[PDB]
């Protein structure tokens, strides 16, 4: 009763839907299944499959400290290279530990430069089609080769006691960022409060200026922002940890972007295995893991510094050549599904899902998807709960402004496992219905998935 369920949805919402028994060649439900749509975070299903095929479940991201030169009486005569590898889980502590290892190895002083090497990747750290306005948000932090603590930092914004005075910013001292406030404090119930925005404006070298207005508040406003220049940020963290460990140097911090032969590895950190990281990625919809993996796929397949284009080409090739899926006119722009350039039909995603199901004993893939009513993004999915399908749906969600997708597997009343793709976009509610905007979605899903479960 798809057309009927559609009437639950806001005016003019666009659904493309396909439901098909695992291993079958004809769908049970086909509603605009050939139509292209924005996949949002369901793109991560493709990223995970191509990643397992190209890199394997035991791949680890790695970061090293390398020396180029001889060490004479504790002095490195040459450069220290910190070679980053797009590990999305690297932490400040890891940098601190690698420096401790460097110190313990006998290096007290560097007669030379400190190089922040990001040559594993090239070109922009932002995928084509990502909205500019989200670039300062942590969910869209540029997934650079140099990541520390997810390239996200937090700040506290305090209103001035005196209306009219500048709001002021508190930030922890260890974050190598530079904050400026041009934020005017407003009285509690100002009319100027209506159209005066509070904005963040990023500058070079991880400078951020806050502008606009802030109404007086009793508690400081917590804000979190994305680092725009990972290389500089990681360099500053490295500089701080070197100084704390008493290692001095004569040169400066420089970027090394061109491919080069590695020095001797004196310290290293490897991530958890790729299967573990893909699990986090699929359970929680981790954009940063998805996108670091995506550019790593292209680097590994083509032996070139990883770029968005190389990743797109690689994923297409892997799907066709290793999984037997020709994605045709599909557009793959990134790994996370954030890009509004991504475009794929349910019927194409269905081929991917059918491949995964067929090879699931090899891939151990379906166990990584959120299980409705249990974990990940589906722990609390109201539509699926009310449908009676908790514990019976393993599926990847995808959500952007106006896009509410699901893609995965359902075990039905008969025990038949079915793959399904729900691509719902163009979803918008009347301006006076905003913080209720999700009830039509919930009503739609409750009915749809009960139907699928009960009738198959
Ligand atoms: C993929 O769809 C991702 N979407 C976004 O990051 C956009 C977004 C949405 C809401 C708040 C902030 C940013 C991830 N997938 C969705 C999803 O699976 O529904 C999440 C909300 C889990 S983020």
Swiss-Prot record:
Pathway: Cell wall biogenesis; peptidoglycan biosynthesis. Pfam families: Peptidase_S13. It is found in: Periplasm. GO terms for cellular component: periplasmic space; plasma membrane. InterPro entries: Beta-lactam/transpept-like, Peptidase_S13. GO terms for molecular function: carboxypeptidase activity; endopeptidase activity; penicillin binding; serine-type carboxypeptidase activity; serine-type D-Ala-D-Ala carboxypeptidase activity; serine-type endopeptidase activity. Residues 69-242 are annotated as: Absent in class-A beta-lactamases. Belongs to the peptidase S13 family. This is D-alanyl-D-alanine carboxypeptidase DacB. One of its GO terms (biological process) is regulation of cell shape. Its EC number is 3.4.16.4, 3.4.21.-. The keyword Cell cycle applies. The gene is dacB. Substrate binds at residue 396. PANTHER family: D-ALANYL-D-ALANINE CARBOXYPEPTIDASE, PENICILLIN-SENSITIVE CARBOXYPEPTIDASE A. The active site is at residues 41, 44, 285. It comes from the Bacteria. Keywords: Antibiotic resistance, Cell cycle, Cell division, Cell shape, Cell wall biogenesis/degradation, Hydrolase, Peptidoglycan synthesis, Periplasm, Signal. Not involved in transpeptidation but exclusively catalyzes a DD-carboxypeptidase and DD-endopeptidase reaction. In E.coli there are three murein endopeptidases: two are penicillin sensitive (DacB and PbpG), the other (MepA) not. It catalyses: Preferential cleavage: (Ac)2-L-Lys-D-Ala-|-D-Ala. Also transpeptidation of peptidyl-alanyl moieties that are N-acyl substituents of D-alanine.
């Amino acid at each position: 009763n798809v057309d009927e369920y559609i009437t639950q949805l806001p005016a003019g919402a666009n659904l493309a839907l396909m439901v098909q028994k695992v291993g079958a060649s004809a769908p049970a439900i086909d509603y605009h299944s050939q139509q292209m749509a924005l996949p949002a975070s369901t793109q991560k299903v493709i990223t995970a499959l191509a990643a397992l095929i190209q890199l394997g479940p035991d791949f680890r991201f790695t970061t090293t400290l390398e020396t180029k030169g001889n060490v004479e009486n504790g002095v490195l005569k040459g450069d220290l290279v910190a070679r980053f590898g797009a590990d999305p889980t690297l932490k400040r502590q890891d940098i601190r530990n690698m420096v401790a290892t460097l110190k313990k190895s006998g290096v007290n002083q560097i007669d030379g430069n400190v190089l922040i090497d990001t040559s594993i990747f090239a070109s922009h750290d932002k995928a084509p089609g990502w909205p500019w306005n989200d670039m300062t948000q942590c969910f869209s932090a540029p997934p650079a080769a140099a990541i520390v603590d997810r390239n996200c930092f937090s700040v506290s914004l305090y209103s001035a006691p005196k209306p009219g005075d500048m709001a002021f910013i508190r930030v922890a001292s260890y974050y190598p960022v530079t904050m400026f406030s041009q934020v005017r404090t407003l009285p509690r119930g100002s009319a100027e409060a209506q159209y005066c925005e509070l904005d963040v404006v990023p500058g070079d070298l991880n400078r951020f200026t806050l502008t606009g207005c802030l109404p007086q508040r009793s508690e400081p406003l917590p804000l979190a922002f994305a680092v725009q220049d990972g290389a500089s940020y990681a360099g500053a963290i490295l500089k701080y940890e070197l100084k704390q460990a008493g290692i001095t140097w004569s040169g400066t911090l420089l970027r090394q972007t061109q491919v080069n032969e590695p020095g001797t590895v004196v310290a290293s950190k490897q991530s958890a295995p790729l299967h573990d990281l893909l699990k986090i990625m699929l359970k929680k919809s981790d954009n940063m893991i998805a996108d670091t993996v995506f550019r790593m796929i292209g680097h590994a397949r083509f032996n070139v510094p990883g770029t968005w284009r190389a990743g797109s080409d690689a994923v297409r090739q892997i799907l066709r050549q290793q999984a037997g899926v020709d994605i045709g006119n599909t557009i793959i722009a990134d790994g996370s599904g954030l890009s509004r350039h991504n475009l794929i039909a349910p019927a194409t995603m269905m081929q991917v899902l059918q491949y995964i199901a067929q090879h699931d004993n090899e891939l151990n893939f379906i166990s990584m998807l959120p299980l409705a009513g249990y974990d990940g993004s589906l722990q609390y999915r109201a539509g699926l709960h009310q449908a009676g399908v908790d514990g019976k749906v393993s599926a990847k969600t995808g959500s952007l402004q106006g896009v509410y997708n699901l893609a995965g597997f359902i075990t039905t009343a008969s025990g038949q496992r079915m793959a399904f793709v729900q691509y719902l976009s163009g979803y918008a509610v009347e301006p006076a219905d905003q913080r209720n905007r999700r009830i039509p979605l919930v009503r739609f899903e409750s009915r749809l998935y009960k139907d699928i479960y009960q009738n198959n």
